[PDB]
Design an enzyme around this catalytic site. Structure first.
Site, PDB file in Angstrom:
ATOM      1  N   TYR A  61       0.715  -1.227  -0.028  1.00 58.32           N
ATOM      2  CA  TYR A  61      -0.051  -0.185  -0.411  1.00 58.32           C
ATOM      3  C   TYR A  61       0.582   1.398  -0.133  1.00 58.32           C
ATOM      4  O   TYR A  61       0.577   2.251   0.239  1.00 58.32           O
ATOM      5  CB  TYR A  61      -0.733  -0.669   1.226  1.00 58.32           C
ATOM      6  CG  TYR A  61      -2.132  -0.888   1.102  1.00 58.32           C
ATOM      7  CD1 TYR A  61      -3.355  -1.301  -0.209  1.00 58.32           C
ATOM      8  CD2 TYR A  61      -1.922  -2.609   1.487  1.00 58.32           C
ATOM      9  CE1 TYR A  61      -4.214  -2.211   0.031  1.00 58.32           C
ATOM     10  CE2 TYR A  61      -2.928  -3.616   1.849  1.00 58.32           C
ATOM     11  CZ  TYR A  61      -3.759  -3.041   1.009  1.00 58.32           C
ATOM     12  OH  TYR A  61      -4.821  -4.749   0.771  1.00 58.32           O
ATOM     13  N   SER A 131      -0.326  -7.019  -0.593  1.00 59.76           N
ATOM     14  CA  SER A 131      -1.471  -6.271  -1.726  1.00 59.76           C
ATOM     15  C   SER A 131      -1.853  -6.030  -3.321  1.00 59.76           C
ATOM     16  O   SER A 131      -2.588  -6.805  -3.775  1.00 59.76           O
ATOM     17  CB  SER A 131      -2.138  -5.248  -0.379  1.00 59.76           C
ATOM     18  OG  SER A 131      -1.420  -4.165  -1.946  1.00 59.76           O
ATOM     19  N   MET A 132      -2.307  -4.274  -3.391  1.00 53.84           N
ATOM     20  CA  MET A 132      -2.844  -4.560  -4.416  1.00 53.84           C
ATOM     21  C   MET A 132      -1.218  -5.243  -5.584  1.00 53.84           C
ATOM     22  O   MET A 132      -1.478  -5.410  -6.424  1.00 53.84           O
ATOM     23  CB  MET A 132      -1.858  -2.778  -4.358  1.00 53.84           C
ATOM     24  CG  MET A 132      -2.587  -1.444  -4.673  1.00 53.84           C
ATOM     25  SD  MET A 132      -4.052  -1.421  -4.407  1.00 53.84           S
ATOM     26  CE  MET A 132      -3.886  -0.089  -3.201  1.00 53.84           C
ATOM     27  N   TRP A 156      -5.780  -7.674  -3.316  1.00 55.79           N
ATOM     28  CA  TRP A 156      -6.649  -6.208  -3.374  1.00 55.79           C
ATOM     29  C   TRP A 156      -6.304  -6.617  -4.938  1.00 55.79           C
ATOM     30  O   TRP A 156      -5.371  -6.264  -5.248  1.00 55.79           O
ATOM     31  CB  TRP A 156      -6.120  -5.048  -2.474  1.00 55.79           C
ATOM     32  CG  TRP A 156      -7.356  -4.208  -2.286  1.00 55.79           C
ATOM     33  CD1 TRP A 156      -8.046  -4.039  -1.301  1.00 55.79           C
ATOM     34  CD2 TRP A 156      -7.997  -3.617  -3.413  1.00 55.79           C
ATOM     35  NE1 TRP A 156      -8.602  -2.602  -1.829  1.00 55.79           N
ATOM     36  CE2 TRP A 156      -8.806  -3.165  -3.385  1.00 55.79           C
ATOM     37  CE3 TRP A 156      -6.752  -3.151  -4.516  1.00 55.79           C
ATOM     38  CZ2 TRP A 156      -9.271  -1.810  -3.733  1.00 55.79           C
ATOM     39  CZ3 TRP A 156      -7.578  -2.566  -5.756  1.00 55.79           C
ATOM     40  CH2 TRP A 156      -8.898  -1.431  -5.054  1.00 55.79           C
ATOM     41  N   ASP A 176      -6.958  -8.765   7.982  1.00 60.41           N
ATOM     42  CA  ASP A 176      -7.085  -8.114   7.133  1.00 60.41           C
ATOM     43  C   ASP A 176      -8.560  -7.474   6.963  1.00 60.41           C
ATOM     44  O   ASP A 176      -9.767  -8.024   6.382  1.00 60.41           O
ATOM     45  CB  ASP A 176      -6.717  -8.518   5.691  1.00 60.41           C
ATOM     46  CG  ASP A 176      -6.816  -8.080   5.059  1.00 60.41           C
ATOM     47  OD1 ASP A 176      -7.172  -6.754   4.365  1.00 60.41           O
ATOM     48  OD2 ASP A 176      -5.693  -8.170   3.656  1.00 60.41           O
ATOM     49  N   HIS A 208      -3.751  -7.125   7.618  1.00 60.91           N
ATOM     50  CA  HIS A 208      -2.649  -6.561   6.259  1.00 60.91           C
ATOM     51  C   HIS A 208      -1.419  -6.192   6.166  1.00 60.91           C
ATOM     52  O   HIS A 208      -0.865  -6.359   5.410  1.00 60.91           O
ATOM     53  CB  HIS A 208      -3.972  -5.628   5.496  1.00 60.91           C
ATOM     54  CG  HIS A 208      -3.602  -4.029   6.090  1.00 60.91           C
ATOM     55  ND1 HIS A 208      -4.370  -3.763   7.203  1.00 60.91           N
ATOM     56  CD2 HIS A 208      -2.927  -2.810   5.625  1.00 60.91           C
ATOM     57  CE1 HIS A 208      -4.267  -2.214   7.437  1.00 60.91           C
ATOM     58  NE2 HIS A 208      -3.091  -1.781   6.657  1.00 60.91           N
TER      59      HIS A 208
END
EC number: 3.1.1.74
Length: 259
Positions: A61, A131-132, A156, A176, A208
């Site tokens: 993130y 994540s991303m 994500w 998360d 997360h």
């Protein structure tokens, strides 16, 4: 030849939770030197003249390669060339991070210092990301079937279906709240093609930020998946088959890797 790609002693679960047998050197890829990604840090084996497989890894993130330094070093020490990127921007979305991973992999093949290129078998490449970045891992895996493996960590993504044949191991975090397991990690897992080898593992009592510091479960499963598929090293099958782990709150697999 038995297994040309095999590296290191016989593994024990224990050894897979700390830095491995190979010495590690780092090289900063300056932001000022490359186009389609931010900078990065390459972690690689010194003190040997074998070649290893390569891994590009996206942060989560943030743009910071430092946030996954422990895991770049970790995987390197067990026998990998590992380029952890900075992203062009703090706020890059999953699909842009897929682009950046792509560029980092081309960087490894075509553009790295001679020290690095020397340790690297550019035919054996894989991706990971937080994540991303994890969403990116799925996208890039979908686009490059020649990747050996993908490991999304607390991933994500707005899109839920990825048509990849690349072996995927997803690490969800039970607590998360940014990428809730039932809206992200588990859909990703369920939507992958039936014929693709896949494992979902869910960390109990983790959020997360779990991948942002040294973590035994993430270490064991990431190293094992990489070893299994990048190195065809079936000595790692034992950590991914008939799993029984109190660190885990869920475990799902089509068990194609236990064949």
């Amino acid at each position: 030849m038995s297994n040309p790609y095999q590296r290191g002693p016989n593994p024990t679960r224990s050894a897979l939770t700390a830095d491995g047998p190979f010495s590690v050197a780092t090289y900063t890829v300056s932001r000022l030197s490359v186009s389609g990604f931010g900078g990065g840090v390459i972690y690689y084996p010194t003190g040997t003249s074998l070649t290893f497989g390569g891994i590009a890894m996206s942060p989560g993130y943030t743009a910071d390669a430092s946030s996954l330094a422990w895991l770049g070093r970790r995987l390197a020490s067990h026998g990998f060339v590992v380029l952890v990127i900075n992203t062009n921007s703090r706020f890059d979305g999953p699909d842009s991070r897929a682009s950046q991973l792509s560029a980092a992999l081309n960087y490894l093949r075509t553009s790295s210092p001679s020290a690095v290129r020397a340790r690297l078998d550019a035919n054996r490449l894989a991706v990971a990301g937080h994540s991303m970045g994890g969403g990116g891992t799925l996208r890039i895996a979908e686009q490059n079937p020649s990747l050996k493996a993908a490991v999304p960590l607390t991933p994500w993504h707005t899109d839920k279906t990825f048509n990849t044949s690349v072996p995927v191991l997803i690490v969800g975090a039970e607590a998360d709240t940014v990428a809730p397991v039932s809206q992200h990690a588990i859909p990703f897992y369920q939507n992958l093609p039936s014929t693709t080898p896949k494992v979902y593992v869910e960390l109990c009592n983790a959020s997360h930020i779990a991948p942002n510091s040294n973590n035994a479960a993430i270490s064991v499963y990431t190293i094992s998946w990489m070893k299994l598929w990048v190195d065809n090293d079936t000595r790692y099958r034992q950590f991914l088959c008939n799993v029984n782990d109190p660190a885990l709150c869920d475990f799902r697999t089509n068990n194609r890797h236990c064949q």
